[PDB]
Design a protein around this ligand. Structure first.
Ligand SMILES: Nc1nc2c(c(=O)[nH]1)N[C@H]1C(S)=C(S)[C@@H](COP(=O)(O)O)O[C@H]1N2
Ligand SMILES: Nc1nc2c(c(=O)[nH]1)N[C@H]1C(S)=C(S)[C@@H](COP(=O)(O)O)O[C@H]1N2
Ligand SMILES: [Mo]
Ligand SMILES: [Mo]
Lengths: 371, 359
């Protein structure tokens, strides 16, 4: 089934080959603000579709039973191209930290199941208004997405977002056909993927074949029975996915990319660097950094341009240059605060869950200073 | 429970705080910075400074008759709620609130959106604009209480911002802003300006002391000699919060069953999706039952009241802890020291209550 999959950069840390899942090494992760296409993390549940672009058609089911069938050419020409810089973070980012507390079910991601790119495409809003849908519906409606990738029986990958997000101009939801100025790579949804800014990676459906408006959420296995958070007391014999909401917006998150665990850094000065981000378009307003395991803190410098309010879809790269004394031991910890003053919890055990998702307790890195 | 008399500031006893979903008007916590105005209703006018230089001046009668009344159930939480937990770590400056600087009511008024539109402003302005508010209460110098919110929140239909003249079906009490106050749902109590005199649209935030030099969060490392209010944003939306109202600290409860109760709430219209309760100081957890009716997505302005009934052995010690999770899966931090700040605001670490079980 995976014979036709695309070639991938080797540098990427591969945690699953069939289907292909891989993350960039931490030492490359936050070198640039936009993550290069060949190192942007990859999460595939199924074999990668091989799509011929000229015959490709996007099906959008119209409001009274009609159907709109869009070629790539129309998707590009009929709707004004919008570009949005947005970070995708997988729900399982930093899963490994949670697994060490107690084994979980999921891909063993470290801190790199997150990448940033400048996306371009048709606004989902413009496409749905074109198909005949109104700006607002009575009650709770959803927009469902289906991919061209399918399981043995033929069930495709699928997901949904609330209709209000789909139709909001400010939410900047795209039917993306460009990534960092080039056509979408195969691994990243060629020819067309959904990009949902501020929202968990799982809803940004790749190799999009269909868009439908429904009174209910997508019935996909990954919408109904995956990507939810549970109490740490829940285990496999008690988990009941009907008791929790689908992950949409994500909580505030941060990690240290430099230095790396085990490093013996030279004395004098040390530049600690990392990334921080929060869901829902909430900007990172402060990143606190400790060198003594969280007893004392210093304020990092936030690199990057401010985005408009509520539209902070891209991560904040941060740094802190600090003097270091030969022979000393450092425990580097980071924590970020967002625009609603949400914060990261101290520890992992109270936020533990059986699938190892929503891992946002403070990141901790042990290094020493060369004698 | 009064922690200041002149001016007046007070919170309901925890035994009454969460008995009812809507907090009675006589119980609703009160935060006043300045003397309470005695506003004479007939000559009262709300001034709204229009886009061109004009002034829309509205009487209370006009406010009620020209705009369709909108009702919104919303919880107000003060920035200093649970300040006493901050103080326990290191001394802070501020009113010594416990867990009761939070209350809920059904607000009734005109939409701020409709008033601004009525005055000729547009649905959107390019760039970051603000809507500023001034109260009739004033300091010795004569400076009034003031605050602002971003223009986009003020004009959003979904944001439910009101110029309220009713509170739980009765006219606004004096202590709660008679005849009119701003109610900003999902936003810190500070921006809900009471005894409203004026509404203005500006390219900049309100220049008021409480908007510029108060109600911000800082790194725990900041102290009075290094604090710089320019380095942090004004608090608007608040983070996820919870507390235990029953039992009380130091209690000795009878063996058999125990019903733990409390409240949970999050800012920005984010509903509370779960409340985890521990009886062993945070080692193990159980899921509480949430009492409430869901609000539409993004419009959960009111708290969720919760309870858990659990067996308790005779002669044991309990450390009851609660933590809440919101619809964006934001969570509460374990401890206070790492969220400490010099004003003791934004106190949202887990609430811990110790009790013993009788023999
Ligand atoms: N059709 C399709 N879309 C999908 C996937 C999937 O398996 N199939 N995986 C999802 C999840 S879980 C993640 S985290 C993101 C990853 O996007 P990326 O590989 O471009 O980083 O894609 C989402 N889109
Ligand atoms: N005019 C004016 N309004 C104000 C106040 C103020 O002192 N004067 N205090 C503010 C703050 S800090 C709080 S927490 C809330 C409290 O409202 P309440 O007294 O009706 O509970 O009102 C806000 N509105
Ligand atoms: Mo994911
Ligand atoms: Mo307040």
């Amino acid at each position: 089934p995976f014979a036709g999959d695309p070639p991938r950069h080797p540098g990427l840390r591969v945690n699953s080959q069939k289907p292909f899942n891989a993350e960039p090494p931490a030492e490359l992760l936050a070198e640039r603000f936009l993550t290069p296409n060949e190192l942007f993390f990859t999460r595939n549940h199924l074999p990668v579709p091989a799509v011929e672009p000229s015959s490709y058609r996007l099906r959008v089911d119209g409001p009274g039973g009609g159907t709109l069938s869009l070629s790539l050419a129309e998707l590009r020409s009929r709707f004004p191209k919008h570009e949005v810089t947005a970070t995708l973070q997988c729900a399982g980012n930093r899963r490994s930290e949670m697994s060490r507390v107690r084994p979980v079910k999921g891909l063993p991601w470290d801190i790199g199941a997150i990448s940033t790119a400048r996306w371009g495409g048709a606004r989902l809003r413009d496409v749905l208004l074109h198909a005949g849908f109104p700006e607002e519906l009575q009650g709770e409606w959803h927009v469902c997405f289906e991919g061209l990738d399918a399981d043995p029986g033929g069930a495709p990958y699928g997901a949904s977002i609330p209709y209000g997000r789909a139709l909001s101009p400010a939410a900047d939801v795209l039917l993306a056909y460009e990534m960092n100025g080039t056509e979408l790579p195969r691994d990243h949804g060629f020819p067309v993927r959904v990009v949902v800014p501020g929202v968990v990676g799982a809803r940004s459906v790749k190799w999009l074949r269909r868009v439908a408006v429904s009174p209910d959420e997508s019935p996909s296995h990954w919408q109904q029975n995956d990507y939810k958070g549970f109490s740490p007391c829940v285990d496999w014999d008690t988990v009941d996915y009907r008791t929790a909401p689908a992950i949409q917006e994500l909580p505030v998150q941060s990690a240290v990319t430099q230095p790396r665990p085990g490093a013996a850094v030279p004395p004098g000065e040390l530049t600690v660097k990392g990334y921080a981000w929060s869901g829902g378009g909430r900007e990172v307003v402060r990143v606190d950094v400790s060198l003594d395991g969280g007893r004392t803190w210093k304020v990092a410098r936030l690199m990057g341009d401010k985005a408009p309010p509520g539209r902070a879809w891209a991560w904040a790269l941060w740094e802190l240059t600090v003097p270091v004394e030969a022979g000393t031991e450092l425990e580097i910890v980071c924590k970020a605060v967002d625009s609603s003053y949400n914060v990261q919890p101290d520890s992992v055990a109270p936020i533990w869950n059986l699938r190892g998702v929503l891992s946002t307790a403070w990141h901790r890195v042990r290094v020493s200073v060369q004698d």
